Short mmCIF file of C-alpha atoms in Angstrom, two decimals:
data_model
loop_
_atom_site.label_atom_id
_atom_site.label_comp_id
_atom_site.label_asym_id
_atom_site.label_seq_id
_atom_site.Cartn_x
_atom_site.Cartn_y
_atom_site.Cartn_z
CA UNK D 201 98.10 129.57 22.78
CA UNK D 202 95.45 130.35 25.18
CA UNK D 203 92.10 128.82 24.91
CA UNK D 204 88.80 129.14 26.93
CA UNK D 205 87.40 125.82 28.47
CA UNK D 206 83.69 125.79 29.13
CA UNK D 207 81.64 123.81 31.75
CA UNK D 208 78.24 123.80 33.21
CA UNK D 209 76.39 121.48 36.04
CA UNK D 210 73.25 121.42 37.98
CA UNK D 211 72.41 121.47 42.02
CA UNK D 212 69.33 120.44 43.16
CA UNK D 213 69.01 122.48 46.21
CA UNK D 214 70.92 125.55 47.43
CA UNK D 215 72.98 124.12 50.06
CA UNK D 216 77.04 125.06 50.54
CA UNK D 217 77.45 121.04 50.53
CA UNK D 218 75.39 120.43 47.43
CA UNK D 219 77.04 123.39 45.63
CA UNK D 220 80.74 122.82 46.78
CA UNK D 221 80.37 119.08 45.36
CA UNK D 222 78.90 119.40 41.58
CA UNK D 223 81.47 122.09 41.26
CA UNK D 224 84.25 119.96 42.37
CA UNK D 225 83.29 117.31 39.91
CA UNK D 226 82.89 119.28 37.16
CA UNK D 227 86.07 120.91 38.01
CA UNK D 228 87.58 117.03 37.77
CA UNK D 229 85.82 115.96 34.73
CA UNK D 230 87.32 119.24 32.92
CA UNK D 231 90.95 118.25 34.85
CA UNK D 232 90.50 115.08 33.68
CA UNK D 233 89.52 115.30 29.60
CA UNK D 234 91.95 118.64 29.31
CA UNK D 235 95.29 117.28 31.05
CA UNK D 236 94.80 120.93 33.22
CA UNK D 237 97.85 121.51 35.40
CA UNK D 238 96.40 124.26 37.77
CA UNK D 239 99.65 126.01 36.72
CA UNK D 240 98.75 126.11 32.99
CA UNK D 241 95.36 128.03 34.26
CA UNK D 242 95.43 131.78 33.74
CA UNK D 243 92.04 132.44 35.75
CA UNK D 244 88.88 131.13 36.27
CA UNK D 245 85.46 132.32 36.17
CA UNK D 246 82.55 130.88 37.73
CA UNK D 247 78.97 132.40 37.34
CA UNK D 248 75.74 131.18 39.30
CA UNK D 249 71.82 132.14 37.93
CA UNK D 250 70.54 134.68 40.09
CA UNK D 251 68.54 131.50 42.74
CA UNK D 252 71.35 130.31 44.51
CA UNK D 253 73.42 132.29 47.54
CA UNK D 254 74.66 130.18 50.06
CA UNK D 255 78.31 130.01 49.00
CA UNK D 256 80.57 131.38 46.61
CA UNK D 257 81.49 128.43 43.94
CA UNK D 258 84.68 129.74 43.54
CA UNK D 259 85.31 127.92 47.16
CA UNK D 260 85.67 124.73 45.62
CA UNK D 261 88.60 125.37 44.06
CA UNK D 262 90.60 125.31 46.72
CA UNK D 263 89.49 122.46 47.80
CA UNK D 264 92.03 120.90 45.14
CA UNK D 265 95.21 119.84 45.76
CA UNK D 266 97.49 122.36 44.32
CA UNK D 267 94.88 125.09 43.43
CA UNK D 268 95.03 127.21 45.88
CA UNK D 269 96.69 129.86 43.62
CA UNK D 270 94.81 129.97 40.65
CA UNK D 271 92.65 133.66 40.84
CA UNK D 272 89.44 132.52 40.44
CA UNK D 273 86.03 135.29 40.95
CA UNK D 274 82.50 134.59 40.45
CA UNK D 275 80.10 136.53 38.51
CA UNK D 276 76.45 136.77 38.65
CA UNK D 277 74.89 135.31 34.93
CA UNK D 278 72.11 136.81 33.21
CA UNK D 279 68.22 135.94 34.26
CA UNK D 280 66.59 134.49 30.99
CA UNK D 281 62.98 133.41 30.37
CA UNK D 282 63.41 129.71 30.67
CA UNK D 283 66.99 130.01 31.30
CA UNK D 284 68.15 126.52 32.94
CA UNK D 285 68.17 127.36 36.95
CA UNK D 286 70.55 126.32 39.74
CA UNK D 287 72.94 126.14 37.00
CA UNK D 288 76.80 127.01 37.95
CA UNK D 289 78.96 127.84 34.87
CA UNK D 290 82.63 127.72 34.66
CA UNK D 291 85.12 129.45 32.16
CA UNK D 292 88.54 128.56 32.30
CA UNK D 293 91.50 130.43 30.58
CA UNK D 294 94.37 128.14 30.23
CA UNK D 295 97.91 127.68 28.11
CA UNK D 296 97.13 124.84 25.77
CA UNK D 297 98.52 123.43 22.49
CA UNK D 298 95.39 121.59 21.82
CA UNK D 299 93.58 122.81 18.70
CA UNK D 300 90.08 124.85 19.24
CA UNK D 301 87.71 122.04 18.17
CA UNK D 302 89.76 119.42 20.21
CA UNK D 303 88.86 120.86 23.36
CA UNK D 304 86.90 119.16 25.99
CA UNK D 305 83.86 121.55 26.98
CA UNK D 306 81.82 120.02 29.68
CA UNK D 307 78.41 119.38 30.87
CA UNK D 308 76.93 117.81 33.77
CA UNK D 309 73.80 116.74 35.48
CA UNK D 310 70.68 118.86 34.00
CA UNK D 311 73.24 120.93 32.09
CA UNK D 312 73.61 118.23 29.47
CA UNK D 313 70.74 120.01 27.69
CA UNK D 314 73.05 123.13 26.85
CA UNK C 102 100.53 139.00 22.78
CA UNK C 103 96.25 138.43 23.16
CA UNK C 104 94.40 141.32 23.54
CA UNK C 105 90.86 142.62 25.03
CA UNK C 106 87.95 143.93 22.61
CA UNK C 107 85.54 145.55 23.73
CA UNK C 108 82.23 146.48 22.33
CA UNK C 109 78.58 147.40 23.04
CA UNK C 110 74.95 148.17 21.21
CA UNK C 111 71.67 148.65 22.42
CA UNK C 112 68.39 147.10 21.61
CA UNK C 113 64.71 148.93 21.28
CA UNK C 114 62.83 146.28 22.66
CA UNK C 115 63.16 143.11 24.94
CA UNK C 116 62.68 140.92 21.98
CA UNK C 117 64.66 137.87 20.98
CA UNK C 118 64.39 138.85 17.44
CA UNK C 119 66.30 142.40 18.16
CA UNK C 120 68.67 141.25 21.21
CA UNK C 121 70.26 138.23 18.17
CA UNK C 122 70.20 140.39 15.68
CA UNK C 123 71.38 143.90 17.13
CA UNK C 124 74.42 141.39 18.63
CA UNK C 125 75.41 139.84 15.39
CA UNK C 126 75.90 143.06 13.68
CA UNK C 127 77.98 144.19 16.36
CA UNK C 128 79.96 141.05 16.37
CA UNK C 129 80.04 141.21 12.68
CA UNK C 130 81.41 144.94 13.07
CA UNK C 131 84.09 143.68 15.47
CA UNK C 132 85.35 141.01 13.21
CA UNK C 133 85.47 143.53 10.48
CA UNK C 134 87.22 145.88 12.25
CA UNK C 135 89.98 143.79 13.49
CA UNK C 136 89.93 140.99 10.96
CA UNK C 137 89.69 138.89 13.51
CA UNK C 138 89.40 134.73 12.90
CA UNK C 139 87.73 132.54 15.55
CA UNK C 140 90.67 130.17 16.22
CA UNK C 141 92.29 133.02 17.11
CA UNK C 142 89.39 133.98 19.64
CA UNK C 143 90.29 132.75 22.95
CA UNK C 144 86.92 133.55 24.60
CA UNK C 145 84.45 136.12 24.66
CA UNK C 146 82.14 137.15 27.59
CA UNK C 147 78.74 139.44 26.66
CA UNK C 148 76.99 141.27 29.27
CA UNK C 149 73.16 142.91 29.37
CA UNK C 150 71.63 145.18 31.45
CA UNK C 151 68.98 143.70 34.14
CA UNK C 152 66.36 144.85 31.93
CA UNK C 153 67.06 142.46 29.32
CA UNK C 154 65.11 138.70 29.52
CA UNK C 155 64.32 137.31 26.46
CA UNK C 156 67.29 135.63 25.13
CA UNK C 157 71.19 134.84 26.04
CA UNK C 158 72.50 137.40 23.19
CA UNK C 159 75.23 134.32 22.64
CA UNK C 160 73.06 132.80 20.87
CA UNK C 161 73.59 134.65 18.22
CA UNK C 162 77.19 133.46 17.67
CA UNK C 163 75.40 130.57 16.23
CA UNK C 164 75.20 132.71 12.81
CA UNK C 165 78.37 133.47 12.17
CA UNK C 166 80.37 130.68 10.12
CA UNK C 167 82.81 128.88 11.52
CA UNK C 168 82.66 130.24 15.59
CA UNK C 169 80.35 127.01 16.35
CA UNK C 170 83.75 126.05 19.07
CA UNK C 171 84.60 129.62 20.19
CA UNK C 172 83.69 129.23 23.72
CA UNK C 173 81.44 132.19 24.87
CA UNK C 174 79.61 132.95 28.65
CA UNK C 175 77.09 135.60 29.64
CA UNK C 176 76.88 137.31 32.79
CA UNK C 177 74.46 140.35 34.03
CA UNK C 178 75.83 143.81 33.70
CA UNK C 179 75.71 145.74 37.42
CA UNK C 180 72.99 147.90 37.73
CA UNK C 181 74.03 151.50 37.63
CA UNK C 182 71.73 154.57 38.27
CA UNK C 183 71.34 155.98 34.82
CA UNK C 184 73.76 154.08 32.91
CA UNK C 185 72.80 153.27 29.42
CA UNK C 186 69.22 151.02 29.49
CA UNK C 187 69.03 148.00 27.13
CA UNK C 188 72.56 147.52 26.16
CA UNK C 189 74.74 144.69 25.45
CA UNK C 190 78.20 144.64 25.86
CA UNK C 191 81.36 142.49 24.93
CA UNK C 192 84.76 141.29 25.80
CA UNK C 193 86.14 139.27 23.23
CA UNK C 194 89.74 137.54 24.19
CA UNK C 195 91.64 137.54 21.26
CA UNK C 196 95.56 136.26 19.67
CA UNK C 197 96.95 139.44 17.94
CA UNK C 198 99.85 141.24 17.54
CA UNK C 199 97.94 144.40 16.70
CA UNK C 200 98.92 147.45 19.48
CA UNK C 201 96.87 147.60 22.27
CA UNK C 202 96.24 151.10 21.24
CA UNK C 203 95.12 150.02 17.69
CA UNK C 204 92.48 147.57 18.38
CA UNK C 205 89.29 148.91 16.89
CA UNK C 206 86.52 148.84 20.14
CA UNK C 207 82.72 149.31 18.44
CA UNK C 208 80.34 151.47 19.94
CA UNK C 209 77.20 151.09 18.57
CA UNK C 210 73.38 152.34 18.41
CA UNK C 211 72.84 154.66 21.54
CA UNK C 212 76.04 152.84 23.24
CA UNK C 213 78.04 155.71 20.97
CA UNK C 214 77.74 158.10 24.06
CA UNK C 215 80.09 155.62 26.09
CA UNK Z 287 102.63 133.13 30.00
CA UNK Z 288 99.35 135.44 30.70
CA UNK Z 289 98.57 135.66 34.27
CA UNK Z 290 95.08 136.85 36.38
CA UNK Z 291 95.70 139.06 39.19
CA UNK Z 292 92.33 139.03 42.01
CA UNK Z 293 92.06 142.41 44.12
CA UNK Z 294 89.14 143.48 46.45
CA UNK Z 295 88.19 146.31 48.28
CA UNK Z 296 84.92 147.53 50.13
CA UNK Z 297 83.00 151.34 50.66
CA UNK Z 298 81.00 152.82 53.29
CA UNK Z 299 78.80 154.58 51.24
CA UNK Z 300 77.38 153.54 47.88
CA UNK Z 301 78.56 157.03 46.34
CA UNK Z 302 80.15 158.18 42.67
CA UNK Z 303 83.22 159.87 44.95
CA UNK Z 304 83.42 156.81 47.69
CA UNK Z 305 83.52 154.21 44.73
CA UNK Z 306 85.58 155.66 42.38
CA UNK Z 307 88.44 156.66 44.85
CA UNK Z 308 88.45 153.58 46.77
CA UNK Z 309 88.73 151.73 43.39
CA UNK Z 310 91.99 153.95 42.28
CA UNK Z 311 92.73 153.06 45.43
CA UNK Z 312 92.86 149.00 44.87
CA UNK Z 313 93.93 149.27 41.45
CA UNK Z 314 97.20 151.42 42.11
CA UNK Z 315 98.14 149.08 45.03
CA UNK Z 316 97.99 146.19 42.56
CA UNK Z 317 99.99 148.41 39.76
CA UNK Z 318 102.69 148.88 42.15
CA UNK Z 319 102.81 145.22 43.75
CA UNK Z 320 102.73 143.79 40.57
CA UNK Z 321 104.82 146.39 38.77
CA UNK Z 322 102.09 146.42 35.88
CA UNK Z 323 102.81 148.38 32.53
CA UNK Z 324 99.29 148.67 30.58
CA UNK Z 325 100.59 147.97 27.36
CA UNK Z 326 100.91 144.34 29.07
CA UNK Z 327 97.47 144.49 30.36
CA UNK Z 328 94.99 142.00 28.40
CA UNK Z 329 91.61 143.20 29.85
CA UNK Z 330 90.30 144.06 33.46
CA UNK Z 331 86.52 142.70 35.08
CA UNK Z 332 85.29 144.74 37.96
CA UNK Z 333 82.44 143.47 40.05
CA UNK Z 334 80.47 144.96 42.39
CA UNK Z 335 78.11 143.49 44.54
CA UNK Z 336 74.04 144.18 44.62
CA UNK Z 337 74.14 147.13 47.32
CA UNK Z 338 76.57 149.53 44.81
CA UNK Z 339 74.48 151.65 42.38
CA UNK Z 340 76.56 155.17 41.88
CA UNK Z 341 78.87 154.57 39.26
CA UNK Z 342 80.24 152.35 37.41
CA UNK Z 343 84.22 151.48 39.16
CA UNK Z 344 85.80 151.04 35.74
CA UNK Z 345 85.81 154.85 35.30
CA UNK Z 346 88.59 154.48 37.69
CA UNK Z 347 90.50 153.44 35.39
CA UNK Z 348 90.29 156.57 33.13
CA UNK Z 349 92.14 158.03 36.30
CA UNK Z 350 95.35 155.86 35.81
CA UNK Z 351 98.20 157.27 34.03
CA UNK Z 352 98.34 155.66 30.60
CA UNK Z 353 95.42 153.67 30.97
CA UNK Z 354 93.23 154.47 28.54
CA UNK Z 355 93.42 151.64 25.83
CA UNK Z 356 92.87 148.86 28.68
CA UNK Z 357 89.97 147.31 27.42
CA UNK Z 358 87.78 146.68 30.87
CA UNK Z 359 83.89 145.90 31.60
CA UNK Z 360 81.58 145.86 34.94
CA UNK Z 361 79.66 142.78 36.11
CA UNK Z 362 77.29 142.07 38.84
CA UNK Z 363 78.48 139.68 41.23
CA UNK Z 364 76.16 137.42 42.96
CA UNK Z 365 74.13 137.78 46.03
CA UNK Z 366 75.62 135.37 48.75
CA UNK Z 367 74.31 134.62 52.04
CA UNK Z 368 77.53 135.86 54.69
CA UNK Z 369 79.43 137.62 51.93
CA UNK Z 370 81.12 140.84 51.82
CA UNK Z 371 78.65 143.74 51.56
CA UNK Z 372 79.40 146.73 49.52
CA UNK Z 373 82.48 145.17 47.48
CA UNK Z 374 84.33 145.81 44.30
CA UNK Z 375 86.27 142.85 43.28
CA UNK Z 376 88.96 143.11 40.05
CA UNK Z 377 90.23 140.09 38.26
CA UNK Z 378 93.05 141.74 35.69
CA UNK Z 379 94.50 139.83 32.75
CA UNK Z 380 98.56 140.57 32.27
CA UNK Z 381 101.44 139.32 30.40
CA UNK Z 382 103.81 137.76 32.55
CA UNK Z 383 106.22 134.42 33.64
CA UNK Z 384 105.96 135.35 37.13
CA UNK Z 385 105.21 131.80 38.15
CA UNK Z 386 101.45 131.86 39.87
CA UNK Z 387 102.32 131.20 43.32
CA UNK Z 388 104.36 134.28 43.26
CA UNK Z 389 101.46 136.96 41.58
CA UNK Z 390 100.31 139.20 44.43
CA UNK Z 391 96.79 139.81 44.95
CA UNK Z 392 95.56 142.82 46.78
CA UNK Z 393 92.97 142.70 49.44
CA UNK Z 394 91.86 146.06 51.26
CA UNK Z 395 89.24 147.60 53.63
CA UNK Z 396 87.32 144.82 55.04
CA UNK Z 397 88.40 142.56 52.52
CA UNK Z 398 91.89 142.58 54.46
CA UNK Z 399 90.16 139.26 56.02
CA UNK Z 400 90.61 137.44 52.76
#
């Protein structure tokens, strides 16, 4: 079947190094817990609160060996009164067996508040 | 096959209270519509306009029995001059056989006129 | 499987006429590389970035032969530092076993560069 995958994680400072890097871990933590082949992944979004511009997230993706096809676009999320801020989110579309409440969402640095 | 359903509503004021509840009776309405089940819900994205602060309308997925693992996103709808002020809008991912041109899309509040 | 399919494009001016034709424009170039049917279509996301106002681009859509049960929405795309000004970005959702490596994304105007 085809089940979303959900992730979140924070930067500290709106850099292109600092962003590319907690997005490539939280990309690996979700590999990791979800067995994702980047083959198995239909498309991936990626969404930023409305503080941080210096790079697209989306450009650590293919910064992973053998993900340099998977479409991937980025989308700008919603501004909310206490919202948490600098926070990337990631939702990933992929062909899995694994059962709705088996699957490994994931949540990293301030995100583990969500 | 898994389908795209689409649906949108309006609120009357910025006010947590009306953005959770004017959401869960359109979820509710999609759901009814299309019978649909949340295991079979892949995802679901909801959008609102840039005028729209006080809460992350996904929060009202919280009330609806047994979605607690559907995994659901927000992102901000683009601004367009004189498009349709104080609306929220969905995209929910689902697994159906139902013809594409037999899913029931809701349209409700002032969102009717789209 | 279901496979997403990434298209951009870019306009000179932020107009209802310049937006909506350059859109047609994208979309039918991805129809035709991908050999699309819409009855295979899961959903369709256009973004647009912070400098497009007119019109929404999904009305281009209405404009497609046959179209008119594809479920798609608009999004705002974020505001990066260096990024393409004045883009409209699709990510579409088909019904397909074309393996990924072999999908064809379409990249036009000044997005040719991507």
């Amino acid at each position: 079947m085809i089940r979303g995958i959900r992730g979140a994680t924070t930067v500290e400072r709106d850099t292109e190094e600092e962003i590319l890097q907690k997005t490539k871990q939280l990309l690996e933590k979700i590999i990791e817990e979800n067995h994702t082949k980047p083959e198995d992944v239909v498309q991936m979004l990626l969404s930023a609160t409305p503080d941080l511009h210096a790079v697209f997230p989306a450009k650590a993706v293919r910064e992973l060996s053998g993900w340099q096809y998977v479409p991937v676009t980025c989308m700008q999320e919603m501004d909310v009164t206490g919202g948490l801020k600098k926070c990337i989110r990631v939702m990933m579309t992929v062909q899995t067996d694994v059962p709705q409440d088996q699957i490994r969402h994931v949540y990293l640095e301030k995100a583990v508040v969500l």
